[PDB]
Amino acid sequence: NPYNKLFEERIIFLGVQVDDASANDIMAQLLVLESLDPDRDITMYINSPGGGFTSLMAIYDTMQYVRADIQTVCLGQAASAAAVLLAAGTPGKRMALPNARVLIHQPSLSGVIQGQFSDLEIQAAEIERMRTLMETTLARHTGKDAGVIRKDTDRDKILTAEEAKDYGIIDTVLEYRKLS
């Protein structure tokens, strides 16, 4: 199928919500591709409406860890964890298509975490830690001060491909290659 062919070309397609199972598959693919050829580049295509933070950091460390450079291309949209992973690509090789949409926002829960107040003190502390780490990671890769990112990500901040370039999430906006 198309995805196995893309893999044979050292292409990972991050086309799903970045759940835990999804993060496992992505990390397995990165590890296998590094093993096959540590020097040749890996290209990761990003088109995903969201994902969790724990899965985000799993993929992020695997991306930084492998020897091969990772080229990141945003198709469609890169939202929240896909946005961080887009920023996390190798500098000079972070790219997006002209109408690509990048959405960055503070991490959030769904459902409810229940427990004793003493358990929820800990859970709230960990969630604040996750927000801090997200903002710090983006600062490392975008060049914006973590304080500015902390303010910007308070509400859904949607960037166009050009704005994502000016904001430091991507290095360039792809030109169309149509021969005609």
Binding site: Q106, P107, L109, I113, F117, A124, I127, R131
Partner: protein
């Protein structure tokens, strides 16, 4: 309704019941009853019988302020089980008229809740939890005479008291025998 017939006859005798999980329905019904009884005769006591598995803190505060501000003394009785807001409202009766029945159980535990929003909203929810925890422990300390430090330590996990242990601890003033 027979249940209501019995309860209304007792309401005319200034006896009211807290018989379920404290929520807004119970708190509002019970506050209305206390207001009504105090309006009818502000000199006579109200006897509140408590048998409850627990309940919401906001609803419990409605009940508690209505009890405190009522011009009449309110006596409290622990029958069956008085758990967490049943325990609070039991200990919240006027000092000298807080009763346990011999085979009652009184359960003290730290508040429960949950976290739902974005990281920012969760920071806010956690701050409000901290405030609530401190206030509930402060009021338990005022009720029982125990140091607030002891309330916080004891309420860490489910702390069961028998009627005798509750009397020594300070939740109640008397245990009724006959």
């Amino acid at each position: 309704s027979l249940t209501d017939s019995v309860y209304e006859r007792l309401l005319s005798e200034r006896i009211i019941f807290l018989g379920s999980e404290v929520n807004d329905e119970i708190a509002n019904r019970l506050c209305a009853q206390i207001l009504l009884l105090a309006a009818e005769d502000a000199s006579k006591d109200i006897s509140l019988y408590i048998n409850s598995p627990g309940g919401s803190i906001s609803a419990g505060m409605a009940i508690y302020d209505t009890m405190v501000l009522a011009p009449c003394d309110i006596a409290t009785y622990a029958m069956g089980m008085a758990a967490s807001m049943g325990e609070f409202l039991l200990a919240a009766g006027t000092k000298g008229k807080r009763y346990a029945l011999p085979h009652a159980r009184i359960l003290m535990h730290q508040p429960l809740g949950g976290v739902t929003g974005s990281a920012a909203d969760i920071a806010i929810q956690a701050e409000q939890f901290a405030v609530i925890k401190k206030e509930m422990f402060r009021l338990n300390a005022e009720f029982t005479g125990q140091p607030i430090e002891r309330i916080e330590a004891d309420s860490d996990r489910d702390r069961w008291f028998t009627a005798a242990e509750a009397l020594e601890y300070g939740f109640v003033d008397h245990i009724i025998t006959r």
